[PDB]
């Protein structure tokens, strides 16, 4: 199947019509997405098949065909871009300065941008176009609006 780098929609026909359930990033022949999107199921790329390689429900991350490849980090100062990919709509950069999830284990970048759940897995980039993590796991705040973590995995 298609193994060109870039960002991809994750689709199912198991419901009415073709439904987008999420998004992910192909890099170095590895597809990266969020666990809640695929539930660790295999994927089709035309005739090709993608089998899960690595997964962790707690990090809410999953890689296909190879180990996690994305090792770039928010620097804690600079603005970032959500390369958002919503259902039915074209890819669209949306520039923002991340806030902060303060946890007992450490502080994590957070992006305050609200999009449909099918957008989960859209990459966040630094100024050099490197993926510093994925959008779609976080929290609903006092307002009723959504705040996502910048979720990143470890490269080995």
């Amino acid at each position: 199947g298609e193994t060109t780098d870039g960002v991809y929609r994750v689709m199912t026909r198991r419901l009415l019509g073709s439904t987008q359930v999420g998004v992910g990033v192909m890099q170095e022949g590895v597809f990266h997405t969020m666990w809640h999107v695929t539930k660790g199921a295999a994927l089709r790329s035309g005739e090709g098949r993608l089998d899960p390689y690595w997964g962790d429900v707690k990090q809410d991350l999953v890689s296909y065909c190879g180990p996690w490849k994305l090792d770039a980090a928010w620097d804690g100062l600079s603005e970032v871009q959500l390369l958002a990919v919503p259902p039915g709509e074209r890819a669209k950069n949306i520039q923002t300065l991340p806030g902060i999830f303060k946890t007992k284990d450490g502080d994590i970048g957070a992006v305050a941008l609200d999009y449909p759940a099918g957008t989960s897995g859209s990459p966040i980039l630094d100024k050099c176009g490197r993926v510093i993590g994925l959008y779609g796991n976080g929290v609903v705040i006092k307002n009723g609006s959504y705040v996502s973590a910048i979720t990143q995995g470890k490269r080995e």
Binding site: M11, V25, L43, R44, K58, A91, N93, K102
Partner: protein, 39 residues
């Protein structure tokens, strides 16, 4: 069976729409990977 379709390159686009705020939030993360607001 889920399938994938390509939707773009991964590039920083100068003069993109600039929006959203920058909240500092107290959160906990459970064994199921769900974040929650610590208050």
């Amino acid at each position: 069976d889920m399938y994938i379709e390509r939707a773009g390159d991964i590039t920083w686009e100068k003069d993109a729409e600039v929006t959203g705020n920058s909240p500092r939030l107290d959160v906990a993360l459970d064994e199921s990977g769900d974040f929650s607001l610590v208050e």
